[PDB]
Amino acid sequence: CIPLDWTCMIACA
Amino acid sequence: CPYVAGRXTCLXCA
Amino acid sequence: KGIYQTSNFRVQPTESIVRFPNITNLCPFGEVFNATRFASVYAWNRKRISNCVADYSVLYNSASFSTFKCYGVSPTKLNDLCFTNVYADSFVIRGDEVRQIAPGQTGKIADYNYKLPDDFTGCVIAWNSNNLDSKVGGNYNYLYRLFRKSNLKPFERDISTEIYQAGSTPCNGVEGFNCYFPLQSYGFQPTNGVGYQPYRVVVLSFELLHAPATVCGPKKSTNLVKNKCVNFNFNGLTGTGVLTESNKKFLPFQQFGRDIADTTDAVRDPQTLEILDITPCSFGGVSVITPGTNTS
Amino acid sequence: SNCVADYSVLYNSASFSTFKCYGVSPTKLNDLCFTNVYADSFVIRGDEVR
Amino acid sequence: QCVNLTTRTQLPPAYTNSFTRGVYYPDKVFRSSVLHSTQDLFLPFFSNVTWFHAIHVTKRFDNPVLPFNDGVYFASTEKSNIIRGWIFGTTLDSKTQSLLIVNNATNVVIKVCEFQFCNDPFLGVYYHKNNKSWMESEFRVYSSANNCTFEYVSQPFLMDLEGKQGNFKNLREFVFKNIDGYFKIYSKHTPINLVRDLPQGFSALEPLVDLPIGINITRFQTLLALHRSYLTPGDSSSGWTAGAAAYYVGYLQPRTFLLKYNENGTITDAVDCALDPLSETKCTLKSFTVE
Amino acid sequence: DVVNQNAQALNTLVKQLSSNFGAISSVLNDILSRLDPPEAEVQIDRLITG
Amino acid sequence: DVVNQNAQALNTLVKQLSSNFGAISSVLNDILSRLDPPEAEVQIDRLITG
Ligand SMILES: *[C@@H]1O[C@H](CO)[C@@H](O[C@@H]2O[C@H](CO)[C@@H](O)[C@H](O)[C@H]2NC(C)=O)[C@H](O)[C@H]1NC(C)=O
Ligand SMILES: *[C@@H]1O[C@H](CO)[C@@H](O[C@@H]2O[C@H](CO)[C@@H](O)[C@H](O)[C@H]2NC(C)=O)[C@H](O)[C@H]1NC(C)=O
Ligand SMILES: *[C@@H]1O[C@H](CO)[C@@H](O[C@@H]2O[C@H](CO)[C@@H](O)[C@H](O)[C@H]2NC(C)=O)[C@H](O)[C@H]1NC(C)=O
Ligand SMILES: *[C@@H]1O[C@H](CO)[C@@H](O[C@@H]2O[C@H](CO)[C@@H](O)[C@H](O)[C@H]2NC(C)=O)[C@H](O)[C@H]1NC(C)=O
Ligand SMILES: CCCCCCCCCCCCCCCCCC(=O)O
Ligand SMILES: CCCCCCCCCCCCCCCCCC(=O)O
Ligand SMILES: *CC(=O)N1CN(C(=O)C*)CN(C(=O)C*)C1
Ligand SMILES: *[C@@H]1O[C@H](CO)[C@@H](O)[C@H](O)[C@H]1NC(C)=O
Ligand SMILES: *[C@@H]1O[C@H](CO)[C@@H](O)[C@H](O)[C@H]1NC(C)=O
Ligand SMILES: *[C@@H]1O[C@H](CO)[C@@H](O)[C@H](O)[C@H]1NC(C)=O
Ligand SMILES: *[C@@H]1O[C@H](CO)[C@@H](O)[C@H](O)[C@H]1NC(C)=O
Ligand SMILES: *[C@@H]1O[C@H](CO)[C@@H](O)[C@H](O)[C@H]1NC(C)=O
Ligand SMILES: *Cc1nc(C*)nc(C*)n1
Numbered sequence: 001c002i003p004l005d006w007t008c009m010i011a012c013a
Numbered sequence: 014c015p016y017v018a019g020r021x022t023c024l025x026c027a
Numbered sequence: 028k029g030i031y032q033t034s035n036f037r038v039q040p041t042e043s044i045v046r047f048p049n050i051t052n053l054c055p056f057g058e059v060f061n062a063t064r065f066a067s068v069y070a071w072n073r074k075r076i077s078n079c080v081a082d083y084s085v086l087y088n089s090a091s092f093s094t095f096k097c098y099g100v101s102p103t104k105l106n107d108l109c110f111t112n113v114y115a116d117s118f119v120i121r122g123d124e125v126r127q128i129a130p131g132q133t134g135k136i137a138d139y140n141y142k143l144p145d146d147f148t149g150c151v152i153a154w155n156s157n158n159l160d161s162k163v164g165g166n167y168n169y170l171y172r173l174f175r176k177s178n179l180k181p182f183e184r185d186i187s188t189e190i191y192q193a194g195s196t197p198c199n200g201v202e203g204f205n206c207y208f209p210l211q212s213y214g215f216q217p218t219n220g221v222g223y224q225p226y227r228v229v230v231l232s233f234e235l236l237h238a239p240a241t242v243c244g245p246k247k248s249t250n251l252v253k254n255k256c257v258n259f260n261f262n263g264l265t266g267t268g269v270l271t272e273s274n275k276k277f278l279p280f281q282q283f284g285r286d287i288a289d290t291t292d293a294v295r296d297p298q299t300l301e302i303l304d305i306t307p308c309s310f311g312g313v314s315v316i317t318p319g320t321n322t323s
Numbered sequence: 324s325n326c327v328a329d330y331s332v333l334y335n336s337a338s339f340s341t342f343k344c345y346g347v348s349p350t351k352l353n354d355l356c357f358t359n360v361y362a363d364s365f366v367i368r369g370d371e372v373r
Numbered sequence: 374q375c376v377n378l379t380t381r382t383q384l385p386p387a388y389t390n391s392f393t394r395g396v397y398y399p400d401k402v403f404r405s406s407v408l409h410s411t412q413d414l415f416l417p418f419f420s421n422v423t424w425f426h427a428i429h430v431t432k433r434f435d436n437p438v439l440p441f442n443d444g445v446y447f448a449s450t451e452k453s454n455i456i457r458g459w460i461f462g463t464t465l466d467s468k469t470q471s472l473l474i475v476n477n478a479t480n481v482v483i484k485v486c487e488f489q490f491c492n493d494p495f496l497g498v499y500y501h502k503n504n505k506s507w508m509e510s511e512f513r514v515y516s517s518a519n520n521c522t523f524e525y526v527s528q529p530f531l532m533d534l535e536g537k538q539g540n541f542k543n544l545r546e547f548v549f550k551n552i553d554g555y556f557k558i559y560s561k562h563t564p565i566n567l568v569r570d571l572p573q574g575f576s577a578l579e580p581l582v583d584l585p586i587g588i589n590i591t592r593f594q595t596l597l598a599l600h601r602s603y604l605t606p607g608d609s610s611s612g613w614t615a616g617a618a619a620y621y622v623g624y625l626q627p628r629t630f631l632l633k634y635n636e637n638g639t640i641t642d643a644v645d646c647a648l649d650p651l652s653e654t655k656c657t658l659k660s661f662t663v664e
Numbered sequence: 665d666v667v668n669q670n671a672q673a674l675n676t677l678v679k680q681l682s683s684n685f686g687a688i689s690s691v692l693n694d695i696l697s698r699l700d701p702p703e704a705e706v707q708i709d710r711l712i713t714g
Numbered sequence: 715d716v717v718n719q720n721a722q723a724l725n726t727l728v729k730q731l732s733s734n735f736g737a738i739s740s741v742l743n744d745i746l747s748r749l750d751p752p753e754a755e756v757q758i759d760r761l762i763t764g
Contacts (some may be wrong), residue, residue, distance in 0.1 A: 023212060264694070
């Protein structure tokens with residue numbers, strides 16, 4: 001998984 | 014009792 | 028004789044449309060209201076409720092509630108709505124303190140253990156649990172906070188066990204004279220009078236009609252018809268209008284769109300995630316031209 | 324008269340089943356002062372508390 | 374295990390200007406082509422915000438315990454992913470509950486526990502010369518965690534740990550609120566290219582998560598990651614270097630803002646109506662232009 | 665100025681439909697979707713007066 | 715008469731602040747020091763409308 005940013009993974013359970 | 018009377022969560026135990 | 032303004036041209040709706048999300052499972056009524064263990068009121072448990080049908084009529088077989096009071100919503104409207112950000116708070120208190128589970132209450136529970144906000148939206152459910160939480164010789168496993176330096180904030184939980192200083196001399200972390208453990212045990216016996224019998228309390232909190240929802244009432248969804256005057260029901264939001272396809276692009280956290288008059292003019296359909304404009308059916312001025320009714 | 328209405332001392336022993344205030348919110352009682360205080364006390368049966 | 378870092382060069386605190394930053398979406402309602410007035414906890418326009426540094430030339434590693442007040446605007450300018458998360462609580466020891474949000478280079482871990490936090494909490498990346506790999510090596514933020522009620526681990530991801538140099542490439546903005554037992558987080562990530570300061574511009578922060586934590590928060594502390602290699606010799610308290618990063622802290626207060634929604638529903642401009650009489654005139658005229 | 669004043673008065677009338685007037689919402693459908701006819705009557709009477 | 719009428723209108727506006735408008739008091743501070751924000755909202759909304 002390559003996120004757009006790590007901060008968008010805070011709301012990704 | 015989890016405690017003796019007057020101690021712990023049994024402070025109000027007469 | 029003259030010309031007279033009348034009402035604007037009205038179009039009546041032809042059919043009723045219900046659009047709820049694709050939701051199959053039932054809500055965990057057995058897990059919430061029929062749990063084996065309940066939390067203490069100082070360490071009250073909060074459980075998230077999501078992706079389920081709130082068909083509360085399944086509680087009619089097993090459950091009997093002595094208290095059921097809703098605040099931001101009428102009880103007879105609960106089947107027609109969808110609920111946003113649902114949480115269930117569960118704890119055990121004595122019978123005399125059930126009245127303290129309400130907004131704007133004082134007392135030791137409402138001050139030191141569990142506090143509801145002033146603008147609380149949701150329902151408070153309580154029922155007697157003497158046969159489950161009382162035992163011969165006394166059940167002392169349920170605790171409450173008797174001592175605190177200040178009142179709790181709404182929906183705040185305090186599970187600290189520091190020694191309370193009830194006098195002038197410091198405690199230095201040990202018990203003694205005017206130095207008490209802040210948590211005290213309820214004494215629940217089956218021969219206690221009502222008022223000192225244990226009551227299980229479930230507090231449901233939710234938001235309504237402002238956001239995407241995933242907990243819904245047991246309403247069946249119809250088909251989506253467009254370009255006609257209909258009565259609609261989008262996730263609990265009712266109304267009358269004509270639904271057309273929209274060019275608006277909603278952000279993923281948005282469910283409804285509003286205009287300058289704060290009326291809902293756009294909605295995302297919960298099954299097919301398209302944006303639909305909402306337009307009122309009635310439009311256009313009408314005048315009648317007459318001679319005298321004594322003439323014709 | 325001439326006393327501090329610190330009702331939190333009742334939290335140890337009292338356990339009321341009815342507490343209803345009329346001209347005042349119960350959360351405002353700690354911040355107020357009271358003019359002509361009288362306490363009326365009697366005993367009735369439980370059906371007549373309403 | 375807790376390590377108290379040494380060899381930090383002492384500097385006076387720095388300050389800068391948050392020009393029009395910190396505006397977030399106040400609700401979840403779509404609006405378009407409208408000027409909408411709302412009252413909420415906003416960072417005021419042209420406010421005096423505190424400037425913190427992580428740099429090694431001088432040597433800075435700024436993770437002080439800061440007050441929370443009524444809400445925090447947090448903005449960080451990074452290139453090598455140095456800011457990893459934050460600590461929220463009151464006493465920040467085992468007597469009270471605290472909220473942990475942290476990126477440990479693979480997941481985002483959100484925990485609400487009675488942490489016995491370290492006096493100098495940090496994360497650690499170690500650089501290998503033999504196969505040129507930067508690896509997550511240390512996690513030294515707490516010594517114990519007991520009696521705890523909220524746990525959340527995110528989906529796994531891949532994040533670059535290389536301590537790059539040059540200009541700052543990422544601007545990450547946050548608004549933290551703690552209202553009625555809910556921890557509300559708003560966020561916005563924009564790509565940037567600048568040297569030292571907080572950029573001037575407008576970007577509306579979108580809602581991220583509402584955490585039902587139910588704890589008292591008065592103080593907060595930023596978690597940073599340091600770098601260790603052969604270029605940094607010594608023990609655990611001295612043998613380290615800091616990658617280049619900076620972060621900015623502002624405070625929210627009740628304000629009335631006039632938000633501009635464009636044709637596509639994006640908040641593109643705002644007026645802080647209590648800033649000056651000209652902005653108050655803009656607010657009462659419901660217009661960004663005054664004749 | 666005559667044309668602008670008439671247009672401004674009509675647009676002010678349109679914009680004043682978002683006033684709550686002391687009710688829980690300025691939206692009739694939002695009130696009627698959540699409340700039974702008695703409390704709905706209370707809120708709607710507030711909106712009608714405003 | 716012009717001066718007297720304008721002075722009388724402003725003084726009447728000042729004197730009309732003592733009207734209760736159906737609320738329990740005409741004093742915002744007396745309402746706020748006795749009631750919590752839910753019923754205080756009802757009384758203050760009555761005073762605001764008046
Ligand atoms: C609530 O929980 C109790 C206990 O788990 C359930 O009682 C069980 O019911 C089944 C079938 O009726 C019996 O076979 C078990 O022996 C019962 N267990 C006990 C301990 O009595 C009860 O059915 C549950 N009620 C609901 C509505 O789920
Ligand atoms: C939230 O935490 C703060 C900080 O611990 C609490 O403020 C303290 O309150 C006590 C008693 O009221 C005082 O003796 C301290 O001096 C206060 N400290 C500070 C730094 O303000 C506050 O009471 C807590 N909030 C709640 C609702 O318990
Ligand atoms: C890091 O520094 C802190 C404070 O400078 C140390 O905390 C002190 O530890 C001593 C011994 O355990 C105590 O007597 C003090 O009361 C502590 N002070 C505070 C403010 O907590 C800590 O031990 C140091 N850590 C290491 C690993 O050396
Ligand atoms: C970052 O934290 C997460 C959560 O604590 C770690 O994921 C767990 O790692 C342990 C140890 O390998 C496993 O037993 C668990 O099954 C993992 N849980 C999940 C949900 O993945 C993760 O390993 C940490 N990463 C680093 C680099 O420290
Ligand atoms: C298991 C938790 C379900 C939560 C559903 C939340 C949305 C619905 C809110 C109202 C739920 C009704 C509660 C039970 C009502 C019982 C009625 C009665 O017996 O008088
Ligand atoms: C002994 C007479 C005291 C007179 C006090 C004057 C008025 C002050 C407020 C009245 C408080 C009455 C007791 C409230 C107890 C609340 C505890 C509970 O809710 O269980
Ligand atoms: C990389 C990954 O897992 N995802 C899924 N997302 C979730 O929110 C779960 C969205 N995303 C982001 O990078 C924000 C991609
Ligand atoms: C809901 O179900 C329908 C089939 O009844 C399907 O076509 C639609 O894509 C679903 N919507 C979702 C899963 O969001
Ligand atoms: C910002 O605050 C600091 C500390 O109060 C002060 O020294 C500095 O002058 C302030 N800057 C401005 C521009 O007001
Ligand atoms: C080589 O890289 C791997 C992972 O990239 C690392 O675990 C290992 O320690 C490295 N080799 C040496 C000798 O350090
Ligand atoms: C907190 O944890 C300690 C040890 O883990 C335990 O002794 C104590 O009872 C706990 N307090 C609670 C659960 O309130
Ligand atoms: C709005 O979106 C459309 C297409 O989605 C685009 O062509 C247009 O430029 C956008 N407008 C603005 C102001 O960004
Ligand atoms: C057995 C017992 N235990 C407690 C805590 N209290 C009483 C009165 N009795």
